[PDB]
Amino acid sequence: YPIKPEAPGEDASPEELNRYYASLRHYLNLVTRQRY
Numbered sequence: 027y028p029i030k031p032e033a034p035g036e037d038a039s040p041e042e043l044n045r046y047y048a049s050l051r052h053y054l055n056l057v058t059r060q061r062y
Contacts, residue, residue: 028053 031053032046 028057 028050032049034042034046
């Protein structure tokens, strides 16, 4: 459960949704790796 990934609006589209997507993967990864 990501508290603050990125989150778009309602326009989404395969670029913004994909951006927030990998930002969620970024967020989720770093959230499990709080190493400095």
